[PDB]
Amino acid sequence: LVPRGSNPPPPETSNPNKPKRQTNQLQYLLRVVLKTLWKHQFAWPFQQPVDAVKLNLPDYYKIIKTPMDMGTIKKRLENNYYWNAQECIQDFNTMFTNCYIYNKPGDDIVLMAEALEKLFLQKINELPT
């Protein structure tokens, strides 16, 4: 009588068909950018996939078609899922914009996302060659 929602499987984090191509920029994204964002005071709501049921967001996956979270990004970096830094940056962008899409501009969670995004853009300015 009250819809409670339901969760998808989490996004894929490995691509076994792809060669292991390590780069300085991807190393930096894992060891500096991701780690720095992870430890920020506002990071915790973004560290794992949204649980629409336990968070009482029963329409979350109706609205958000491409979910993304920092735990998924961390695994993708660890597993060498990304071909380049741009792909990883795109996933951070998807994570922040999903928050802006689902929520209202004045919401606390949006202030948190904006702060993380500003820090992320600062850290991406410091990427290696």
Query: Which residues of the chain form contacts with ligand E0B (CB under 6 A)?
Result: 45-46, 50, 55, 57, 99, 102-103, 108-109
State in angstroms the smallest separation of the CB of 19 from ligand E0B: 33
Residue with the shortest CB distance to ligand E0B: 45
CB 6 within 8 A of CB 52: yes
Place of tokens 């060891």: 31
Least distance from ligand E0B to the Cβ atom of residue 94, Å: 12
Of 43 and 127, nearer to ligand E0B (C-beta) is 43
State in angstroms the smallest separation of the CB of 92 from ligand E0B.
12
What's the rounded Cα separation, in Å, for the pair 82 and 29? 11
Residue closer to ligand E0B by CB (options 45, 58) is 45
Pick between residue 28 and residue 61 the one whose CB is nearest to ligand E0B: 61
Task: Assess contact for 124 and 89: CB atoms under 8 A.
Answer: yes
Q: How many CB atoms lie within 10 A of CB 45?
A: 16
Would you put residue 76 in left (φ > 0), alpha (ψ -120 to 50) or beta?
Answer: alpha
